[PDB]
Design a protein around this nucleic acid. Structure first.
Ligand SMILES: Nc1ccn([C@H]2C[C@H](O)[C@@H](COP(=O)(O)O)O2)c(=O)n1
Ligand SMILES: Nc1ccn([C@H]2C[C@H](O)[C@@H](COP(=O)(O)O)O2)c(=O)n1
Ligand SMILES: Nc1ccn([C@H]2C[C@H](O)[C@@H](COP(=O)(O)O)O2)c(=O)n1
Ligand SMILES: Nc1ccn([C@H]2C[C@H](O)[C@@H](COP(=O)(O)O)O2)c(=O)n1
Ligand SMILES: Nc1ccn([C@H]2C[C@H](O)[C@@H](COP(=O)(O)O)O2)c(=O)n1
Ligand SMILES: Nc1ccn([C@H]2C[C@H](O)[C@@H](COP(=O)(O)O)O2)c(=O)n1
Ligand SMILES: Nc1ccn([C@H]2C[C@H](O)[C@@H](COP(=O)(O)O)O2)c(=O)n1
Ligand SMILES: Nc1ccn([C@H]2C[C@H](O)[C@@H](COP(=O)(O)O)O2)c(=O)n1
Ligand SMILES: Nc1ccn([C@H]2C[C@H](O)[C@@H](COP(=O)(O)O)O2)c(=O)n1
Ligand SMILES: Nc1ccn([C@H]2C[C@H](O)[C@@H](COP(=O)(O)O)O2)c(=O)n1
Ligand SMILES: Nc1ccn([C@H]2C[C@H](O)[C@@H](COP(=O)(O)O)O2)c(=O)n1
Ligand SMILES: Nc1ccn([C@H]2C[C@H](O)[C@@H](COP(=O)(O)O)O2)c(=O)n1
Ligand SMILES: Nc1ccn([C@H]2C[C@H](O)[C@@H](COP(=O)(O)O)O2)c(=O)n1
Ligand SMILES: Nc1ccn([C@H]2C[C@H](O)[C@@H](COP(=O)(O)O)O2)c(=O)n1
Lengths: 26, 422, 187, 187, 187, 187, 143, 143, 26, 26, 26
DNA sequence: CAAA
DNA sequence: CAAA
DNA sequence: CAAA
DNA sequence: CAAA
């Protein structure tokens, strides 16, 4: 049981690299 | 050296996945440019309560006019008060068809090249997948309805299917053999060579990355790339408005509404150019139609489940299709992932029931399910995927109102000095 | 002024349309009523265009039906079912309409016994000699009462004294489990 | 009492008006329906005044249309389209109305095939022998379904048995993408 | 139950009343329409009682008008104008009504050219052979479009085929710039 | 669905009822109108049942009235007055109704001069040849304009061409100064 | 005096407007900016629907001394924002003064109902004044 | 697993139900409570509409070791409260197990619209796992 | 990410003079 | 610019006497 | 008289054991 | 929870 | 980001 | 505001 | 309020 008033969920975000795609992609 | 106050406010709005310019300021060689943008960002009224926040990204780049106008610029500047006037480029005969570069199409349906070329350059050097076709559109009129008004599309937040291995990734390297013998010394070089090839394919597709690889460097002028001056980002939260009438009582509408600052530390502008600042709102690619890769495989092999290190480090990539990740996954979309990558990351879950519930910013339809068996099209954010959850895009998907405080020190005679002759 | 965005019936949009021509054989509740749908609408939103001849080969006082297959996915006990009709008859017969619910193990019912039909009256826009109009809805339990059948709903049209003659108009009906989004200028 | 400021249809104000006289040749859905607009309203708010003769040179049972060109600017998938009609016929024929949507690469459609017309029923204020009245609206997808055409909407008027004779009244129709502001004494 | 306090039209209270008897000469839109007001209501709330003979000395298909002088004080671009009519004719002619706006430098217009009249359709309560009823309103720009004239609004009554005969009832109309206060038991 | 608890007219409950039979002598506004109440309802909520013969001993085009004595206690300038009528005539005459207000030092008015009657139009549910129906209300100043009289309100019924014949139905009318409480399941 | 800052979705940066960008514009060379005569430009040069008959004389490279407010066109026809959804003085004619002065009608658009005009205020004005003034008594008393 | 405490306006104290109140019930004599065999009673003994075919074996004088929740009958037919307005397992038949397990339909009654079933939740699951795992690079790189 | 509840924007308002118009104009 | 949330105005209310009316009047 | 703003009621929840059912049941 |  |  |  |  946590007091606070419901907050919307944010980012699904750690260790080393995962995504290699050839260079930087935002 | 005096202060020029270019502070100004702006009211904007755009589609989800697309990258829009929000404020561009021309600068001069010698200018010391500082920018503090502050304001709030919102999204068109939602259908139901708030589900999840959108990640908002703000960027501020600096582009020398030289990058745009080329050698033609060097002359312009050299010839000084003689120089052949710089050419402008064309937009379609519509007011909005200049949006992507933060401006109403002027009276004469033509805007200055640096605005257009910069937007491209920015897009090609930072937003598109390194393997995707480089955007080349000559003029703002070669741009289609959506793009020209809303900005180019960008990639979904990186996940197992939105951030695969470049499609042309080697899945096997063949080496020539005689008929009964093999040059083990050759087989040696063979591997080494492959290495250099992979290193590139995987993360050195851009010249700069290759050089950096040797432990060198490259001016932004080397590969003519926009200079990323500042990049902030945040999650857009808000609140629910409660229904209070006979039939609305017990209903709720989500009003996303986040305040934010985007500050750019004093910056020294070496050559005449533009300071462009763009935004990009996106929703994490949640889908009630996605499942854990392992739940999908039909014949679970040791090589999958076991997670044996000895294997995970020596097998070639794996070719799988969206079918393997979504129930309605398009099978014609093949992506090459890294082995046991499903053990390096867990996917978001949405009970199917939200499947047909209008109002949540989820992908209620397997990514790229209406663009065809084309990977790139699936990876880039289709903003229509969201039309579903907004009560009324009277101001497109999102919109923002902010004040851009800009202070620039520069060699500039006083207005008096300009208007006074003697 | 302020535009009204609420309504008792939202007519399906681009889908679920079937045109029906030919002879409509009205019947009495003592027999089997004619369900003028062979290609019965599915999505449970139905729009049916009428351009046929109201023929009295059977009884002079009867009723014909237009129906759709209720989506039973919703766990909610029952949902609203709206209808919007506009019929103009040649032969003065003082038409009449309403909403109905009936089950049948058959996927494409051609006719349904009157003692197997449930009625739900609705405010009739008009009921003149040759034109009935109505845009309303009613509450209907959407789950099959007999383990096995498919549930059907639609508007029924009756008359105390029919009259051979061409009839024209539209018969729209929908199971509200979705409210169509719409540009509201002030939001 | 308190004045009501909401309404299913706001009749265009000073603009978009066209008067139409002459012969109106009703037709059957098997052929091409008469779109009595040569100077078809643009702003997608249309007011059409009728003072013509309902002539039956073709079939005795048909329908004629009044239309307007839908503004497709809005990124919203679809918006509301309201209509407000008041027609008084001489020849008792029990009129009938409704809203329709149809496309055509042609800018000023003179007629449209019946198999190319989409219907949207609306509560008819009245549908007596010689006068149909109605002020309502419906939800309609405003974007061209076939890459290239222009989208049209309007009210259609039909009858099971027409009757040569003068007809008079007004046919108003609007695409709600603007709610007219109005003096509300208490604000 | 709870009493409804909203309404599309509030009939003027103790003021603005004029009784009109005699012959009403309906006319066609090609000519000048009869504005049966010599002592035209001012306060821009008008109640007109009818007890006259509908005479067809001119054309058989026409229309007559009842009007009032719009108060132009309000800086608001346009306000609502409601009307509430109840007419019973002897001679079956299927009446019809609506609201209109027209200008004229004349203070007490006796007739207005049809090509100088603007229409605003309204839901007709009823439109039977011998009785039209309606209580509705519409949005109308209240400022004189031509520097100099006075703006007029009112309900117009038309027919496709009139019929000599006595007519009786009331024609009420008001420019909403005031909502009448009223005893609401629970406040 | 959700039950609607608002309404333009609440019919008095157990009290204020009077049955009226006999001959109803409609009259013209030039003479004195028949107020068919001898035992005129008081509580200012009136329900009157009709089962009499519509006789034309006087003029063929007229009107009769049903009234009640307005309670003037309320300090509020004016309150709402609702009426709910349902009349079915034998002789096709296209009835018509509305609400009226008139004063008289007389406690039980038997008839009132037409030039002494104030009209308030109301949306007529229906106005067919032999049946008028209506459930509406209007704003009316409840205080006696002439120091001394009693204020009366009620529904008036008129026709352009009456026709000897039996009439039946109910004439209900109320001064809203009380909203009847009611079981609302969800509170 | 209440006013709204003249924001318009129809205005653009002067430089985005010029068709032939010359050194004298872009460069921002000091030597020039201090010795050239003023520049005659028209509202057309500042708004898409800019009335061309309205000529204004600005100071050279003044577009480098100030940045203009931006409103995505989309707000163009959105009733409710106090912006100038129509190029300044677009309905007063080729008359500069008329364009410069604030046309209050430009705002009728965004108000639900000017029952009390555009704005309105309620305040208490406390005023104290010392002055040579006989007392009311002294005024009403004769003796 | 979400559940609502089994409150019912139809349940009563066992002792209010017994018709012939015996010493062995009321008295609560220890000597007895510890040596008698269990007691077979039916739901009828606990609810007014208690299904009599449902027999349960309880411990003696267990009604003295616990007090039952009370709901004035009036809430009986009031749509909106998560109570068991119908004696447990009243529509599953004389089957005990079926009465004991939670019938979710018993609740359809109180929800305005199960567009998201009875309940629903939104949460973030932060998971950190240490494990022998080559780096993605090591997986994609051959040499 | 800034906490506060959204505020409407004010003035577009520094160095030396810009607007010469002949004298004082409010 | 004053922070507070709008308050309704009160009394129009000092030096010596102004109103002579014959005696005390409330 | 207690100040607080009305709270919904929770659990009907002690001494020794009451429910023997053969083992653990949640 | 053997309130063994 | 070569988690080189 | 002569950013004289 | 004698602002006597
Ligand atoms: C703890 C509280 C947060 O929900 C969770 C993740 O936080 P972050 O902020 O995304 O960890
Ligand atoms: C995140 C966004 C960037 O592409 C990625 C690497 O950033 P860096 O800058 O190289 O991480
Ligand atoms: C910092 C916060 C403000 O938005 C910005 C401008 O403040 P000012 O107050 O206009 O600078
Ligand atoms: C590191 C992790 C975050 O994404 C990044 C910016 O964090 P902040 O919180 O905006 O730096
Ligand atoms: C100003 C002070 C600095 O010398 C000059 C260039 O700065 P940067 O740092 O190179 O501009
Ligand atoms: C601001 C308003 C004034 O016109 C301008 C100069 O003010 P000063 O007072 O001279 O600055
Ligand atoms: C100061 C604040 C108040 O508005 C003003 C008058 O105050 P009083 O309280 O009436 O003086
Ligand atoms: C105030 C109310 C009183 O009439 C007046 C004088 O009061 P006092 O008490 O005389 O001032
Ligand atoms: C005390 C206050 C609480 O209502 C009561 C029970 O608390 P618990 O938490 O269930 O005891
Ligand atoms: C509560 C839930 C468990 O079944 C019961 C005993 O728990 P334990 O763990 O044995 O108490
Ligand atoms: C009490 C119950 C038994 O008699 C004795 C043993 O306790 P535990 O339980 O082992 O204590
Ligand atoms: C680890 C990976 C390589 O084997 C070694 C070199 O590290 P850096 O990366 O240069 O360390
Ligand atoms: C600077 C501008 C002039 O050259 C000099 C005189 O300053 P003030 O302005 O009087 O200083
Ligand atoms: C002052 C007014 C008179 O002249 C004098 C007497 O004061 P008091 O008032 O008694 O003072």
């Amino acid at each position: 049981a946590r007091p606070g008033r419901p907050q919307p969920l944010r980012g699904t975000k750690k260790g080393a690299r995962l995504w290699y795609v050839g260079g930087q992609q935002f | 050296r005096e202060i020029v106050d270019l502070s100004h406010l702006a009211f904007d709005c755009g589609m989800l996945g697309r990258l829009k310019t929000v404020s561009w300021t021309p600068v001069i060689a010698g200018d010391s440019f500082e920018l503090d943008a502050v304001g709030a960002l919102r999204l068109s009224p939602l259908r139901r309560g708030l589900a999840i926040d959108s990640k908002v990204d703000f960027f501020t780049f600096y582009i020398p006019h030289r990058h745009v106008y080329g050698d033609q610029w060097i002359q312009f500047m050299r010839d000084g008060v003689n120089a052949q006037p710089l050419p402008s480029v064309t937009c379609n005969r519509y007011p909005d068809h200049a949006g992507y570069v933060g401006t109403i199409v002027p009276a004469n349906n033509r805007i200055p090249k640096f605005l257009h070329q910069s937007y491209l350059n920015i897009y090609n050097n930072y937003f598109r997948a390194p393997w995707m076709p480089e955007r080349t559109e000559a003029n703002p009129s070669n741009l289609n309805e959506d793009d020209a008004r809303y900005g180019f599309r960008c990639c979904h937040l990186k996940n197992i299917w939105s951030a695969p291995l470049p499609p042309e990734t080697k899945l096997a390297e063949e080496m020539g053999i005689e008929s009964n013998s093999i040059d083990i010394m050759g087989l040696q070089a063979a591997y080494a060579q492959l290495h250099t090839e992979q290193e590139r394919t995987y993360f050195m597709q851009r010249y700069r990355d290759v050089i950096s690889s040797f432990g060198g460097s490259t001016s932004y002028d080397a590969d003519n790339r926009p200079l990323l001056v500042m990049h902030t980002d945040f999650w857009a939260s808000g609140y629910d408005v409660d229904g209070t009438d006979q039939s609305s009582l017990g209903q709720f509408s989500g009003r996303v509404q986040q305040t934010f600052k985007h500050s750019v530390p004093r910056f020294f502008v070496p050559e005449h150019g533009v300071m462009m600042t763009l935004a990009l709102i996106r929703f994490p690619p949640i889908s009630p139609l996605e499942h854990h890769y392992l739940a999908g495989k039909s014949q679970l092999t040791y090589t999958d489940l076991a997670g044996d290190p000895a294997l995970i480090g020596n097998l070639p990539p794996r070719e799988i299709s969206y079918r393997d990740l979504f129930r309605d996954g398009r099978s014609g979309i093949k992506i090459k992932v890294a082995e046991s990558i499903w053990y390096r990351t867990h996917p978001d879950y949405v009970n199917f029931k939200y499947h047909d519930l209008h109002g949540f910013p989820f992908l209620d339809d397997a990514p790229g399910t209406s663009t065809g068996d084309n990977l790139q099209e699936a990876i880039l954010v289709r903003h229509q995927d969201y039309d579903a959850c907004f009560q009324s895009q009277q101001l497109l998907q999102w919109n923002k109102q902010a004040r851009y405080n800009v202070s620039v020190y520069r060699h500039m005679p006083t207005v008096r000095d300009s208007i006074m002759t003697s | 002024m302020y535009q009204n965005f609420v309504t008792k019936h939202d007519t399906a949009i681009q889908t679920s349309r079937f045109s029906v021509t030919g002879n409509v054989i009205p019947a009495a509740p003592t027999g089997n009523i004619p369900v003028i749908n062979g290609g019965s609408i599915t999505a449970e939103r139905a729009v049916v265009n009428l351009y046929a001849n109201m023929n009295v080969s059977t009884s002079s006082d009867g009723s014909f039906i237009v129906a759709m297959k209720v989506d039973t996915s919703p766990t909610d006990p029952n949902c609203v079912i709206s209808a919007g009709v506009n019929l103009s008859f040649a032969g003065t017969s003082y038409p009449i309409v309403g909403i109905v619910r009936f089950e049948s193990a058959s996927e494409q019912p051609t006719s349904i016994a009157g003692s197997e039909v449930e009625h739900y009256p609705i405010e009739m826009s008009v009921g003149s000699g040759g034109v009935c109009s109505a845009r309303d809805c009613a509450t209907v339990d959407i789950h099959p009462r007999t383990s096995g059948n498919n549930v059907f709903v639609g508007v029924i049209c009756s008359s105390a004294k029919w009259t051979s003659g061409r009839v024209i108009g539209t018969i729209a009906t929908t199971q509200v489990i979705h409210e169509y989004q719409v540009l509201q200028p002030l939001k």
